[PDB]
Structure formats: C-alpha cells, structure tokens
Amino acid sequence: GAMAPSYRVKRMDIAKNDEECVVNAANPRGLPGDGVCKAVYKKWPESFKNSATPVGTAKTVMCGTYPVIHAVGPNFSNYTESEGDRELAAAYREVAKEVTRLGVNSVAIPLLSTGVYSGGKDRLTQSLNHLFTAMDSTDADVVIYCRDKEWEKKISEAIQMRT
Numbered sequence: 001g002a003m004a005p006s007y008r009v010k011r012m013d014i015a016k017n018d019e020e021c022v023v024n025a026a027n028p029r030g031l032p033g034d035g036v037c038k039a040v041y042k043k044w045p046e047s048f049k050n051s052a053t054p055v056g057t058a059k060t061v062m063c064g065t066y067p068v069i070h071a072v073g074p075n076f077s078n079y080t081e082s083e084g085d086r087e088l089a090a091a092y093r094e095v096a097k098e099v100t101r102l103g104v105n106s107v108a109i110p111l112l113s114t115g116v117y118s119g120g121k122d123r124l125t126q127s128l129n130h131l132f133t134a135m136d137s138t139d140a141d142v143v144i145y146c147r148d149k150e151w152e153k154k155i156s157e158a159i160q161m162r163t
C-alpha cells in the first residue's frame with residue numbers, strides 16, 4: 001500500500017501516467033475505440049489480447065509487466081439513467097478489486113462514462129462519486145486523469161473538500 005493513500009488529479013494524457021498500472025475506459029469488445037481507449041491502444045496494444053469483457057466489469061491484461069485494467073462503463077446512449085448508474089458503480093467496484101489483487105501502490109484512472117459514453121450529459125460528479133465509493137477502501141495512491149481545464153478544477157475541489 002501507499003504510506004498515506006491519496007487522491008490527485010492531473011490534466012494530461014493517461015498514456016503518459018507515472019503510476020504502477022492504468023485503468024482503460026474500455027469498450028466491451030476489446031476494440032481500439034476512441035478517446036482514452038485509443039490512447040491506451042496506441043501505448044499498450046499488447047494489453048488488448050482477450051480484453052473483451054461485459055459492461056460493469058473490469059478485466060486486467062498485462063503489457064509486459066505493466067497492468068492495464070480494462071473497465072467497461074455503460075454507454076448512457078443505450079442504458080436508462082437507473083441501469084446505467086448501477087453499471088457505472090459496478091465497473092468501479094471491479095476496478096477496486098483488480099487494483100487490490102495486483103498489489104500496486106498507485107493507479108492511473110479516467111472518469112468512466114464521461115466522454116462518448118455520457119449520452120451527451122455532464123457526469124463528472126456521478127462518475128467521480130462512484131470512483132470514490134469503490135476506491136476509498138483501497139490503499140493505492142489514485143491519480144485521476146482528465147483533459148478539460150474546468151474539469152481539473154472541479155475534480156481537484158471535490159478531492160480537497162473531503163480534506
């Protein structure tokens with residue numbers, strides 16, 4: 001575990017992370033995809049061997065010894081708000097199980113279902129709160145990666161609020 005487990009946020013490409021493993025915002029079919037998923041495919045293509053997994057689950061595949069945790073958030077275009085909310089919470093719970101199983105001291109994580117799977121809605125708070133629910137009981141240093149300047153400020157505020 002980390003000596004003083006923390007949350008941090010950085011506004012940069014998660015493919016350039018300084019953590020011991022990465023969470024991919026994957027699609028269920030293990031396809032190269034768009035956004036975070038395409039950056040992850042370019043950086044760690046070997047990790048897409050048998051990475052297909054259902055919505056609401058996470059499947060880890062090693063790129064060398066570097067773990068890529070493929071976490072499949074729901075696409076809110078297809079799911080009801082209710083069912084999507086349940087699957088998004090479940091995906092993060094499976095990420096926490098994988099991070100724990102791997103014994104890493106740090107993890108790089110995007111906000112699941114906030115980009116092309118958001119169904120055109122702002123889900124910063126929904127996705128971040130489900131991240132916290134899952135990861136709060138883990139002792140890994142969590143580093144959240146985002147691309148928008150205003151999102152960085154809002155995520156930083158939410159982290160600092162809890163102290």
Ligand SMILES: [Cl-]
Pocket residue numbers: 011012013016
């Ligand atoms: Cl960057």
Ligand SMILES: [Cl-]
Pocket residue numbers: 025112113114115116117118
């Ligand atoms: Cl997304």
Ligand SMILES: [Cl-]
Pocket residue numbers: 146147148151
């Ligand atoms: Cl963002």
